[PDB]
Amino acid sequence: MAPGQKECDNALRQLETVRELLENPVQPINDMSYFGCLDSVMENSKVLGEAMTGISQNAKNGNLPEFGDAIATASKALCGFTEAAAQAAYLVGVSDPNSQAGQQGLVEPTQFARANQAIQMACQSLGEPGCTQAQVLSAATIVAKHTSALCNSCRLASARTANPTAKRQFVQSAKEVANSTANLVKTIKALDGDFTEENRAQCRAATAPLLEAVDNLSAFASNPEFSSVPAQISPEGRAAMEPIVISAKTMLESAGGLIQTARALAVNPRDPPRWSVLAGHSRTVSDSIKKLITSMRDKAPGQLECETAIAALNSCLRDLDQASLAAVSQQLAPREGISQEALHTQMLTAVQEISHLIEPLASAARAEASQLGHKVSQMAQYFEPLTLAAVGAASKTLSHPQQMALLDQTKTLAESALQLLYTAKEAGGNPKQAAHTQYALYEAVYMMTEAVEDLTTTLNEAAS
């Protein structure tokens, strides 16, 4: 009854509905790439933060219309977070080696069912007698987005099909959905500088042919002939997606709590206990979002492999430090059963392989996230044979200064490789990371190139 209560009511329903995306992410949620998911959570963080400020201030000052605007904006941001979270979880799950992505059909029935549900909610909101101006706009924007998505999928489906009857039906259904929503859009435009009871009644009337067309499309699209095979996600994939899922669930739970409390406060703002409860939920919303973003970044393509490569390089560094400390106290035992020449050849071979991987690695770090993991693993693998050969070669180097110089120079190469790996992990193969990492990447490549040259020179002098 009271203004602002309906908005809180709709928000709670929207948060409960969007939570379903999190229960079993075995199909794509949308068309976003992993980097798109990350961008969306960053953008929604800003939007939700401002909306949360708006909720509190307008409940406190009794500005009920703008309180409803703030609840609506927060709900949209939270659904945004969840869609990005669920999509990220799906992409994580399928990319697992032991996981099998399901065959894509002509359409994804879950996306069709979701769109059907979002259109119903938006249409029912337009069918409300006490619906406001900014509520009509958000409901109108929802309808337009989901009907466009539905029509686009119908078009591609009637192009990818061999079945002539299905071809004609997807085209026909698209026509009906499009013609329906066009008729609704016109009635919504008629509201500008008018907004009368006679006109809101025009809009309500126009929703019925849309709902009917959408519900017909949904039925028809759920036929076994069209549906996708849900993916088979390994127990490991499930484990990797878990942090992302848990975080987004905690976000939704505490945001529900924030809204329930906000609802009472809008009615009676003179209530210190409830301000304390609202603040509690708010801090938990923020913590959950931080954990969600950090969880999602852990699972971007190439991130685990950078981490694994960095661990392997650090293991090589420990070996080199150990050999260096043994050398200075004359306690480095000479490597048995292999010659000085053969050990220098193993070093040169490894150094040449590392050298060839530098620029390819940087280009992946720069532009191609799908390559990065591989290049980082290839680079790191060569450091094990190099370290063993260098420790061996040093152990048999007759001059003490030269023995120490060989270890020092091998260490410098390893440390320059570490700096490149850390920089590549930051850039992550995301073209939009350029303005923050480009000069650091150039520096890291320069330092690596220099360290290769210096060690190669030493190895060339030893060959002479």
Side-chain angles (χ1 to χ4, degrees), residues 2-5 7-12 14-15 17-30 32-49 51-56 58-60 62-99 101-102 105-120 122-127 129-159 161-166 169-185 187-196 199 201-203 205-231 233-269 271-282 284-340 342-452 454-464:
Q5 305 288 285
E7 287 99 313
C8 289
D9 191 6
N10 283 328
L12 286 168
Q14 276 163 330
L15 298 182
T17 303
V18 87
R19 194 181 174 91
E20 295 178 354
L21 305 175
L22 293 177
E23 302 305 339
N24 187 37
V26 287
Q27 302 98 358
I29 278 75
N30 54 43
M32 295 192 295
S33 65
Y34 207 95
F35 294 151
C37 295
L38 287 174
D39 284 330
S40 173
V41 300
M42 301 304 299
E43 286 156 18
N44 276 303
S45 180
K46 172 182 159 79
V47 174
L48 181 59
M52 282 172 62
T53 302
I55 286 164
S56 289
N58 291 299
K60 223 162 208 155
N63 195 329
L64 304 190
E66 315 215 64
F67 166 81
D69 292 355
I71 289 282
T73 307
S75 194
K76 198 196 186 199
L78 287 153
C79 293
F81 268 116
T82 307
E83 285 177 315
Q87 177 71 0
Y90 159 76
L91 292 162
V92 166
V94 287
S95 68
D96 186 85
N98 319 108
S99 294
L106 288 174
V107 286
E108 255 290 355
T110 63
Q111 292 178 3
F112 270 67
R114 284 147 187 169
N116 189 15
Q117 187 171 38
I119 294 158
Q120 275 157 197
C123 282
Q124 284 157 334
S125 172
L126 293 168
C131 193
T132 66
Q133 280 173 10
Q135 276 157 29
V136 176
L137 188 65
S138 51
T141 298
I142 286 167
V143 171
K145 189 185 207 179
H146 288 270
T147 57
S148 275
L150 286 176
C151 290
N152 199 54
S153 300
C154 285
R155 276 155 149 162
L156 300 175
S158 61
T161 183
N163 181 338
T165 303
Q169 191 54 241
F170 276 117
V171 169
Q172 182 58 32
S173 284
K175 188 192 161 169
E176 287 156 30
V177 174
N179 299 7
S180 287
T181 149
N183 185 44
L184 178 66
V185 167
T187 64
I188 287 155
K189 159 142 157 56
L191 296 166
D192 264 359
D194 204 349
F195 213 69
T196 54
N199 277 343
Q202 303 261 269
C203 295
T207 66
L210 178 62
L211 290 167
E212 168 188 337
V214 169
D215 207 65
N216 284 348
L217 175 54
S218 268
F220 170 79
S222 59
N223 191 283
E225 198 204 296
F226 309 131
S227 75
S228 305
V229 183
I233 301 162
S234 73
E236 287 85 349
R238 291 292 182 190
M241 51 208 281
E242 192 58 16
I244 298 177
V245 173
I246 290 170
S247 295
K249 285 179 178 200
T250 311
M251 180 195 69
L252 291 171
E253 172 155 299
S254 59
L258 194 157
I259 290 156
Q260 296 171 341
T261 305
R263 188 179 182 260
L265 287 171
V267 179
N268 185 8
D271 193 336
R274 280 185 168 85
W275 283 117
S276 180
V277 175
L278 188 130
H281 288 135
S282 189
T284 309
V285 167
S286 287
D287 296 2
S288 299
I289 283 161
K290 287 176 64 184
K291 291 167 184 177
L292 176 63
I293 300 161
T294 61
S295 293
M296 287 176 69
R297 295 197 178 282
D298 272 2
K299 309 290 175 195
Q303 294 288 306
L304 180 56
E305 294 96 330
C306 290
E307 174 174 9
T308 303
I310 286 158
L313 257 68
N314 280 322
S315 192
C316 294
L317 275 181
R318 290 196 299 277
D319 288 2
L320 289 166
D321 295 331
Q322 178 182 63
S324 302
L325 187 81
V328 87
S329 56
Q330 198 171 310
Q331 281 148 14
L332 185 63
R335 169 87 174 268
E336 191 180 355
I338 179 171
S339 87
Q340 189 54 306
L343 287 155
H344 286 140
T345 301
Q346 286 173 348
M347 291 181 69
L348 188 49
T349 306
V351 172
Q352 291 171 326
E353 291 314 322
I354 284 152
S355 188
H356 295 131
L357 282 158
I358 297 170
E359 298 280 10
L361 198 159
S363 68
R366 200 167 279 126
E368 205 179 18
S370 59
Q371 274 291 103
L372 183 62
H374 183 229
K375 291 289 153 208
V376 146
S377 298
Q378 276 180 306
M379 172 73 75
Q381 181 275 131
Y382 282 109
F383 273 93
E384 177 163 58
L386 173 58
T387 297
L388 193 63
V391 169
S395 80
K396 288 187 146 187
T397 301
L398 294 172
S399 154
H400 293 95
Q402 287 175 16
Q403 161 182 81
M404 199 60 70
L406 195 71
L407 294 167
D408 291 329
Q409 290 178 16
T410 306
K411 180 178 191 177
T412 297
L413 182 56
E415 289 173 329
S416 70
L418 215 34
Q419 178 65 18
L420 175 62
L421 293 178
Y422 272 112
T423 306
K425 190 185 186 287
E426 188 189 356
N430 191 338
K432 308 233 301 282
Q433 287 282 75
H436 293 276
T437 61
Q438 59 191 347
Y439 301 124
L441 202 46
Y442 160 81
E443 197 260 9
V445 171
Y446 177 82
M447 294 308 289
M448 268 214 85
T449 305
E450 186 101 317
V452 166
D454 202 37
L455 191 52
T456 300
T457 295
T458 299
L459 293 170
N460 286 349
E461 292 172 333
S464 299

